[PDB]
Amino acid sequence: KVVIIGAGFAGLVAARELQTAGIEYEILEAKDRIGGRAWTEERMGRPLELGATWVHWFQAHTWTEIMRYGQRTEITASPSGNDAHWVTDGKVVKGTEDDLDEKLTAAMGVTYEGSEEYFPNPHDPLWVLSDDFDGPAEVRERFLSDDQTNAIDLVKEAGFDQETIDLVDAFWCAGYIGDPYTGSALMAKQWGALSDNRYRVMEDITLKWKLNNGMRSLYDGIAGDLNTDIRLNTPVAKVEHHDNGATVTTESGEVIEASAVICTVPVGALSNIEFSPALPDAVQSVIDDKWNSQGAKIWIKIKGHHRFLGYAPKPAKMSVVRSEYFMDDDTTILVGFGYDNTNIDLNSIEDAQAVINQWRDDLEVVDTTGHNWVADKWAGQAWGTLRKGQFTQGWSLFDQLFFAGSDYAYGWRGVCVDGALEKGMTTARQVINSMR
Ligand SMILES: Cc1cc2nc3c(=O)[nH]c(=O)nc-3n(C[C@H](O)[C@H](O)[C@H](O)COP(=O)(O)OP(=O)(O)OC[C@H]3O[C@@H](n4cnc5c(N)ncnc54)[C@H](O)[C@@H]3O)c2cc1C
Ligand SMILES: NCCc1c[nH]c2ccccc12
């Protein structure tokens, strides 16, 4: 009777939560697989994370699921190396990773400025805008100003040199999964607050520990708890939402009546659904503007064992590339993040070779793979990231129709499964509370 649209983490956890409360539900998934933008798949001779992959015990919702489904000890840290390669001014620079992390640490210290006054409770991101905010009016003028500034301009204005500017350019090409210059600096500042305002903790939480058994160990766990079969290959085309319940029409014309709808379809894919009545103009504006998730994630296999770390600013095909697995077949698997999905074919060896050639001439690519989420009709975006203005006038606007998903979370929004687990569960609680 409650229809959940989408069988990603948010819809799976919402279903389990409704099941706990004894509330009847049905999950409709457009694809022939569950997991959504988390997708552990058999590629290049390894289970590979085609979507998300890193976790941490400081992510409350993700960690509780890790504990629930037996993965407590099944995490492995990504490998480290001694040297990094970077491109500052149309030239490749090689230096120690220690020297790299010092420059990045100093830049993040400037990027985080204000986060202690903005986010004393980092799960209350809009507290500065609240009615009883008790800080100075200056802190109220800097918060709104930061929503309209990108994270690179904060570093340029502090007088950092071009090398550091190019390093943070590359960093946020990966972090903002697209063009960082159109992004909102407050995203970066909230990441810092959730990470005790320390760059090393931020990296520990988002880019260190991998699930040995993949995200699949978690989303199959949740689905394995459900007492109602997920309806795969059942795309939703129309949602009618009134005061008395709602109606959902599938792509095939099947009409489902429902007391409520929990819609986990990401912003990049909401255009496939006709909403009757139409969504509010403020929400439609965000849907038109889309995310800042125009990038891509690649997996590259090269000959030999090489501990590699490369940074390249926009418009590089890939901005951050790092070794992740050393195969017993004398090869290394690297992961890369790039700002523009249309400038790279994730499955073309020549394009992957062009990526490695950004920094080196002695490394040979033998395979490459990736799923282009932006060109995936049911996603339309990688992980959700914020354009200018979307920290205070974006994700919070989505409020018997409820939107749930990582892109609307209070905490680790968009970038982490933690946000999907948070918002799926709390949205189910909204439905539970209304029926009680
Ligand atoms: C490349 C990439 C790497 C990532 N790496 C990490 C990482 O290392 N760590 C981490 O914690 N997080 C990571 N994430 C983030 C994580 O994948 C997401 O935050 C989380 O999976 C989002 O879940 P969701 O349920 O909110 O949305 P989704 O997973 O997008 O679920 C929505 C579901 O709705 C379905 N759907 C869409 N339209 C319709 C329709 N019309 N009818 C029916 N069903 C429909 C979709 O097929 C999908 O199954 C990554 C994301 C990406 C894209
Ligand atoms: N696949 C993990 C995506 C990610 C989360 N945080 C990041 C920071 C920089 C680059 C990628 C990421």
Q: In this structure, are residues 197 and 189 in contact, taking their beta carbons and an 8 Å threshold?
A: no
- What type of residue sits at position 128? V
- Name residue 69's beta-bridge partners: none
Q: What are the boundaries of each domain within the chain?
A: 1-78+206-290+384-436, 79-205+291-383
Backbone angles phi, psi at 216, to 5 degrees: -55, -35
Does residue 178 come out as left (phi exceeding 0), alpha (psi in the -120 to 50 range) or beta?
left
Burial string for 142-152 (b: 16+ CB within 10 Å, else e) reads: bbeebbebbbb
Residue showing tokens 């949205």: 427
Distance (Å) from CA 378 to ligand 1 centroid? 9
Report CA-CA distances (Å) from 187 to 37, 125, 292, 386: 20, 10, 12, 7
Distance CA(352)–CA(70), nearest Å, equals 36
What is the rounded end-to-end Cα distance, in angstroms, of the chain?
A: 15
Beta carbons within 8 Å of 320's beta carbon, 6+ residues apart: 170, 171, 173, 174, 310, 311, 336, 337
Distance CA(348)–CA(369), nearest Å, equals 8
Sort strands 365-369 and 331-338 into parallel, antiparallel or unpaired.
unpaired
> Does an H or E element contain 417, and which?
helix 417-435
HEC profile of 241-274: ECCCCEEEEECCCCEEEECEEEECCCHHHHHHCE
3-state DSSP call for residue 283?
helix
Distance CA(34)–CA(216), nearest Å, equals 9
Distance (Å) from CA 27 to ligand 2 centroid? 29
Which of 40, 383, 413 for mutating ligand 1's site (highest number of atoms within 8 Å of CB)? 383
Alpha helices in 88-226 (DSSP H): 97-111, 115-118, 137-147, 151-157, 162-175, 185-194, 199-206, 216-225
Distance CA(297)–CA(174), nearest Å, equals 9
Note the resolution in Å, 1 decimal.
1.8
Distance CA(414)–CA(397), nearest Å, equals 15
Cβ(30) – ligand 1 distance below 6 Å = yes
Q: In this structure, are residues 330 and 424 in contact, taking their beta carbons and an 8 Å threshold?
A: no
Which of 75, 372, 398, 417 for mutating ligand 1's site (highest number of atoms within 8 Å of CB)? 417
DSSP state of 307: -
Distance CA(341)–CA(374), nearest Å, equals 7
Distance CA(115)–CA(122), nearest Å, equals 9
Distance CA(150)–CA(153), nearest Å, equals 6
Burial string for 343-358 (b: 16+ CB within 10 Å, else e) reads: ebbbeeeebbbebbeb
Question: Cβ < 6 Å from ligand 2: which residues?
Answer: 52-54, 174-175, 206-207, 297, 320, 337, 415
Beta carbons within 8 Å of 98's beta carbon, 6+ residues apart: none
Q: In this structure, are residues 424 and 223 in contact, taking their beta carbons and an 8 Å threshold?
A: no
Q: List gaps in the chain by the residue before each (C–N > 2.5 Å).
A: 399
DSSP state of 231: B
Q: Which two tokens stand for residue 168?
A: 């943070």
Beta carbons within 8 Å of 93's beta carbon, 6+ residues apart: 85, 86, 87, 163
Q: Which of 434, 408, 435 lies closest to 421, judged by CA? A: 408
Distance (Å) from CA 78 to ligand 1 centroid? 22
Distance CA(3)–CA(248), nearest Å, equals 8
How many whole angstroms from its chain centre is CA 152?
Answer: 20
